[PDB]
Design a protein around this ligand. Structure first.
Ligand code: AO3
Length: 386
């Protein structure tokens, strides 16, 4: 058996990447010129370029460096990934025969100009939108299928067409017609992370934790559960890459009450209460993580600031059921508080073992700039036999 290792790089530096350890490199992000009224990026509002791909100056400069990287690994495939969390424009781009043709024409132009091997679409998310951050409509689901079918017909034979899809149970069931789009995609990147929300402690647990259990049923996610949901929806295992996050998250449960929305009196009667005080929030703020804005910490920052804290305020632990590491910090009363879960070489190796045991097509990871001296990608490549 052979396996993929599909590495994303958030470039929009790139020379520190060891591309000998991956089969595919996705450069992130291309954006989409769009007319969504809430768009705040002034560069995307050019009406003469509506529905085309926007490349910032840094993105253009980095894409021109790709022939250098190709020398280091002549087998490497390089794609541009368009979209990302918060990226507007897909709903409109996919909506009509006119808009789709503009977008496809732009994809073809970018692949030719920068000698890319293909394109990755990272739409977060069709139908659902994303809590007011991108426009959506129920027609997104059928329109996404049309866009991918028309992209497949337009792309030169052999160029790659891939997508990234969300962990949410509703993605294969309601948002994306996975059986309908499977004929058009070389592989599908499952974003099997970002689970440390609501009442769940862990961000990318492989299985459910018993020691640190998720309280509300609708929050009970694991990478295994996500894979099973896409398989049950009809995707074949060889077409799937299990996504691995080179980062961790402080769970929302540490700082926000957790709601079980299956309760009739849900909003006023939380089932979990926050356990961070201002003391713990200030510790993270002083290290660059403002928990009022976001909750993630890159793996290299976990290593430098948390695992190697001079005053050893963070203690590393292993959850044998979730198969991922986590850190605790001591409260003012000296009690352990669950601070952050993440991925380390041991847990990355167990996810590669899982890939092999299930016959998945490979691994994907987000993102290479957050690795610690390429150690997580190296472990992934070793465990997968890359
Ligand atoms: C809309 C938004 O919030 N934008 C912010 C962006 O936000 C980033 C960031 O939140 C990143 N999170 C992590 C953990 O790195 C996420 O990263 C996510 C990608 O957008 C998704 N796509 C993939 N793929 C395709 C594998 O993984 C997913 C990844 C992890 O959740 O991208 C966003 C951009 O789109 O971050 C920078 C840096 O603080 C901010 O100035 C701001 O631009």
């Amino acid at each position: 058996a052979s396996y993929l290792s599909v590495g994303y790089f958030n470039g929009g530096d790139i020379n520190k990447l060891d591309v000998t350890q991956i089969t595919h490199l996705n450069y992130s992000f291309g954006l989409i010129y769009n007319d969504e009224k809430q768009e705040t990026n002034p560069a995307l509002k050019d009406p003469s370029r509506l529905h085309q791909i926007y490349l910032s100056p840094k993105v253009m400069a980095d894409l021109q460096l790709l022939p250098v990287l190709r020398k280091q690994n002549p087998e490497l495939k390089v794609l541009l990934s368009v979209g990302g969390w918060g990226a507007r424009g897909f709903s409109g781009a996919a909506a009509t025969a006119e808009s789709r043709a503009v977008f496809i024409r732009s994809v073809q132009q970018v692949i030719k100009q920068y000698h890319l091997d293909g394109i990755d679409l990272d739409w977060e998310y069709p139908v659902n939108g994303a809590w007011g951050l991108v426009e959506s409509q129920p027609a997104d689901r059928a329109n996404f299928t049309l866009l991918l079918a028309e992209l497949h017909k337009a792309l030169d034979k052999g160029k790659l067409l891939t997508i990234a899809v969300g962990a949410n149970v509703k993605s294969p069931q309601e948002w994306v017609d996975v059986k309908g789009i499977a004929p058009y995609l070389d592989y599908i990147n499952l974003m099997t992370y970002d689970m440390a929300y609501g009442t769940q402690y862990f961000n990318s647990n492989l299985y459910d934790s018993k020691q640190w259990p998720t309280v509300a049923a609708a929050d009970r996610y694991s990478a295994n559960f996500v894979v099973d949901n896409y398989l049950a929806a009809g995707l074949k295992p060889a077409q799937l890459n299990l996504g691995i996050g080179f980062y961790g998250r402080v769970p929302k449960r540490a700082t926000e009450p957790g709601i079980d929305w299956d309760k009739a009196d849900a909003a006023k009667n939380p089932v979990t209460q926050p356990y961070f005080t201002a003391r713990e929030t200030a510790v993270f703020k002083a290290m660059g993580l403002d928990l009022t804005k976001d909750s993630y910490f890159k793996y290299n920052d976990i290593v430098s600031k948390l695992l190697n804290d001079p005053q050893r305020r963070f203690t590393a632990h292993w959850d044998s059921d979730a198969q991922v590491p986590y850190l605790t910090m001591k409260s003012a009363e000296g009690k352990p508080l669950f601070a952050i879960s993440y991925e380390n070489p041991r847990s990355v190796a167990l996810k590669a073992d899982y890939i092999k045991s299930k016959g998945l097509g490979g691994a994907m990871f987000w993102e290479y700039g957050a690795d610690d001296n390429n150690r997580l990608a190296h472990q992934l490549a070793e465990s997968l036999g890359i």
